[PDB]
Amino acid sequence: IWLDLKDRIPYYKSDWVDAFNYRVIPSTVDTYFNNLLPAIAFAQDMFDRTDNSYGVNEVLLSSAMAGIVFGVLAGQPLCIVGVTGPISIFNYTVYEIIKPLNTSYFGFMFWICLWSMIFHLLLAFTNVVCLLQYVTTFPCDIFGLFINVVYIQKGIQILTRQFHNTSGEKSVQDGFASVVVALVMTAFGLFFKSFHHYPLFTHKIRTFISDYSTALSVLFWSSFTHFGGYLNDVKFKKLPITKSFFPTSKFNRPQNTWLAYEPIPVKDVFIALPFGIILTILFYFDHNVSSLMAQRHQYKLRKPSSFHYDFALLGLTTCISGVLGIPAPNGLIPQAPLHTETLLVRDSNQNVVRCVEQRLTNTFQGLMILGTMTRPLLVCLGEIPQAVLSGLFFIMGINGLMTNVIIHRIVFLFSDPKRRDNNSPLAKISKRSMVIFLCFSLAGFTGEFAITNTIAAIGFPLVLLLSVIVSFSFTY
Amino acid sequence: IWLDLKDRIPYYKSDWVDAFNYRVIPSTVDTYFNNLLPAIAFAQDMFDRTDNSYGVNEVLLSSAMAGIVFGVLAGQPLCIVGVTGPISIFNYTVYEIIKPLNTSYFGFMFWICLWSMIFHLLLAFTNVVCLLQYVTTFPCDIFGLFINVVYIQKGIQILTRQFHNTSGEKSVQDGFASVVVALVMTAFGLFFKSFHHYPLFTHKIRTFISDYSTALSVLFWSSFTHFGGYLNDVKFKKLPITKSFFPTSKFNRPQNTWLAYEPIPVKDVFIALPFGIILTILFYFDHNVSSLMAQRHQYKLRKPSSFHYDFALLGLTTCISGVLGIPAPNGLIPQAPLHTETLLVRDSNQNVVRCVEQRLTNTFQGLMILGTMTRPLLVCLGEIPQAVLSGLFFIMGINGLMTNVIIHRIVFLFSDPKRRDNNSPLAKISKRSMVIFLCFSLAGFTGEFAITNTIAAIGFPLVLLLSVIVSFSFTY
């Protein structure tokens, strides 16, 4: 483990070298907000969700420091942690189960984190890490599909929610307008993205333009709201959130600790004990899975970088997330990846060529005042209308349906054998066999919506794991 | 003249059979729709404009008898003739201008038509028609562009129009939803098209489908609109009405095709004349341009039909339409290729089967009773939103950016050489200069565009004619 550090740590130094180009800069930029909004997005629900329970802030922060700290020891700089709708789900639980068993929220928060963690230490030594291995074609892409799906459904909800409080008949007076916006926005974005995946235009030109898609967009629409509309001329949405903080404490101190334990009733002392765990594993996983897809060798990577480390580190950090009291930062699922597409040559034509690896964007991404300070920043953030982001869910959303290769693999079915692209033979050759495969994939695909119902969807990976690993069984 | 006859009559004979085929089936249907909207489109403005005068029916009939009658003598019948905002515009002139000049709109009308004919007879023999011909690549595409432009604008305008009757300035009172749908549709439509220019499933698969965009859609969406939406529960907005025949001069009165006001000064009779001239020309023009473009020796045909007669004939018809007190079918445009797209075969193939051709669609277009008498059309008329059509304005619109080769030739800036190549050299090669050409061209679009804003705006094709002709140089 230690060893591991030793390998990587020089590279830390290198991140600096790594810094010097254009791409660094967007990379840093687009994402911040990019997270944040989604982040927001769960948040929004989350907070409400907890019948309201001092929520957002936690995140805002959660993410911000987490980005920084995560920077400081450093794990994968090519991966970045923050939040999820699913951590949120845990949280829904977390308050929820606690409420009838009203208790030391504080004890709990702490608690959960701690137990997992301890274990985590140990775990860090464990070659759970095997699990990872498993990759070549089955888990991951799929994995990403789970994610996607949830993302989108939520996105919708968010809109729809946004429609709902207000009315539902003629004038109009509603979310419909809104509805439009988010969408409208969506179309364009897609375009913005598009030469890059399926080309058409001038290399650089395309590059300059396509890369800040996210920023651009948020802005792009947003400015209609900033400088009025042929629409945005009535009640519209943006952000609720506080002008301060709350004590992230239940003690008297100025400045505080790491390891600990506090003074009160017993039962309650024990039984936080599950809940973290399940969380933990999840994280682990998450982190892992994600990492894998990114890390991958289509994504040609074993180029000077960290398989484990980031895990050990992570758990602690997560643990820590529990410690001040603040949300679980989670692996920034596509997001990191997409960066990774960023941090590469494809300019070229579309061609993967040299990695681009570094701490710095990510560190910045973690760190930066933006993903930090927000209270005067509020003006932008507040200026962010809720709708834009809803739209964002969408732009964000189509993306990465751009990588369910399975789909792709599917896709080939529709189109011509006098069409072909790349590794179409993988399938082409096991043509029939392909079809079946999809099903497998599909199995999860139903399986999870349905699952969510019997216990939150969140459980799936486990199952997924359970699944995926066995799936050698096709393969034949 | 005889000669003219001399082709067509032999050919005439064939036609029914020629008509009898399976692409046909698709063809026949879309076209109706294809009419209906513009028919609408103009209608709405116009009618209102004439604070009621040529109602739905006026068009409906106009078209309906026209499709068939025009169908019967036909000098092409591949083609489609119907109404335009510009006729209307003339009509508008006539409405206002007539009002303090007091002879009944209708009474006045009687002379107008006459002139057209006569002059037209003379014309039928003429080769002012000669002029067009000269055209080899430049105008026409532009010509159609003129149409496009308005078309789109209008669409929007309608949209907004819809917003407009009930109060508001730019805030806005809309079916936001209206906006949504139409658009939404539009995006889709685009999809509905897309494999056909630019593939992604099977020849055949497309071949039943992509083509059937219009109809499919119109219908397809409209019922959602009638029942359904992501939710929907708002006042939705459909389409205007009469159970009988409509009024003609400012009226309450219907005078379903009548002419009983024959007894006032000569004088009154006299001044219809301008309106005819320009009109005729216009029509002529319409015919021409469209026809050429359509006829396209490039899109493979100098094969057997006749303009000279038809033109007369048509014109006459229009002249007659006036007894009826009905608007005039003129050559419809965007549809016009598109039929040809029906009657395309490069994409359940890749080249051609020079089409066979059909009376039927066109005839049908006249004929189908709905698209003819209202009283059963009623349902249809009642059922669809203006908005759907607006969406239609749009899908229909995007199309037909598309043989503005020049546009393509624009594209060429954006597109990259190491990708550029199909027939690109006709353009490609005098690359830089190309632009210029185009610049002009667009410039004309513009010049005119700007001009259009000045009324009688209509003069533009002539101008088009000018432009293009003088451009004899350009090319060099």
**Phi first, then psi: what are they for A375, rounded to 5°?**
-65, -45
Same-domain pairing of B302 and B153: yes
Same-domain pairing of B66 and B82: yes
Same-domain pairing of B106 and B118: yes
Same-domain pairing of A349 and A439: no
Cα–chain-centroid distance for residue A332? 3
Q: Which of B163, B234, B348, B419 to mutate to test the interface with A (most CBs of A within 10 A)?
A: B234
Q: Looking at chain A, which residue has its C-alpha nearest residue B203?
A: A416
Same-domain pairing of A161 and A189: yes
Same-domain pairing of A456 and A392: no
CA A1 – CA A7 distance, rounded (Å): 10
Q: Cβ of B183 and A180 within 8 Å?
A: yes
What angle, rounded to 10 degrees, do the helices at A105-125 and A273-295 form?
50
CA B149 – CA B437 distance, rounded (Å): 20
Host domain of residue A44: 2-398
Question: Resolution of the coordinates in A?
Answer: 5.9
Longest dimension (CA), chain B: 73
Same-domain pairing of B108 and B197: yes
Q: How far away is chain A from the Cα of B233, in angstroms, using its nearest Cα?
A: 6
Burial of A216 (0-12, 13-18, 19+ CB in 10 A): middle
Q: Looking at chain A, which residue has its C-alpha nearest residue B176?
A: A177
Same-domain pairing of B200 and B107: yes
Q: Write the residue in A169, A176, A416 that is nearest to B202 by C-beta.
A: A416
CA A349 – CA A200 distance, rounded (Å): 10
Number of separate domains in chain B? 2
Q: How far away is chain B from the Cα of A345, in angstroms, using its nearest Cα?
A: 18
DSSP for A36-85? Answer: HHHHHHHHHHHHHHTTS-S-HHHHHHHHHHHHHHHHHH-S-SSS-B---H
Q: Cβ of A233 and B170 within 8 Å?
A: yes
Experimental method: cryo-EM
Q: Which amino acid is at A394?
A: F
Q: What angle do CA A199, A34, A217 make, to 5 degrees?
A: 55
Q: Cβ of A176 and B234 within 8 Å?
A: yes
Q: Cβ of A172 and B174 within 8 Å?
A: yes
Q: Which amino acid is at B141?
A: D
Strands B330-332 and B80-82: antiparallel
Burial of A212 (0-12, 13-18, 19+ CB in 10 A): middle
Q: Which amino acid is at B187?
A: A
Same-domain pairing of B432 and B287: no
CA B368 – CA B362 distance, rounded (Å): 10
The residue assigned the tokens 């303090």 is B100
Which residues of chain A are within 8 Å of residue B419 when distances are taken between CB atoms?
Answer: 199-200
Same-domain pairing of B215 and B254: yes
Query: Is B184 an interface residue toward A (CB < 8 Å)?
Result: yes
Structure tokens at B7: 């082709």
Q: Looking at chain B, which residue has its C-alpha nearest residue A159?
A: B230
Listed residues B402, B423, B454: the one ending a domain: B402
Listed residues B402, B421, B455: the one ending a domain: B402
A49, A88 Cβ separation under 8 angstroms: yes
Q: Write the residue in B177, B202, B415 that is nearest to A176 by C-beta.
A: B177
Nearest to B180 by CA among A186, A83, A359, A414: A186
Same-domain pairing of A408 and A325: no
Rg of chain B over Cα atoms, rounded to whole angstroms, equals: 22
B151-189 b/e (C-beta count within 10 Å ≥ 16 → b): bbebbebbbbbbbeeeeeeeebbbbbbbbbbbbbbbbbb
Taken in order A123, A125, A127, A132, is the CA torsion positive or negative?
A: positive
Which residues of chain A are within 8 Å of residue B202 when distances are taken between CB atoms?
Answer: 414-416
Q: Write the residue in B180, B200, B415 that is nearest to A201 by C-beta.
A: B415
| Helix (H) and strand (E) counts in chain B | 21, 2
Same-domain pairing of B447 and B376: no
Listed residues A398, A421, A445: the one ending a domain: A398
Query: Is B134 an interface residue toward A (CB < 8 Å)?
Result: no
Which residues of chain A are within 8 Å of residue B175 when distances are taken between CB atoms?
Answer: 170, 172, 176
Query: Is B169 an interface residue toward A (CB < 8 Å)?
Result: no
Burial of A254 (0-12, 13-18, 19+ CB in 10 A): exposed
Q: Write the residue in B170, B180, B205 that is nearest to A179 by C-beta.
A: B180
Query: Residues 409 to 448 of A: which have CB under 8 A from any B CB?
Result: 414-416, 419
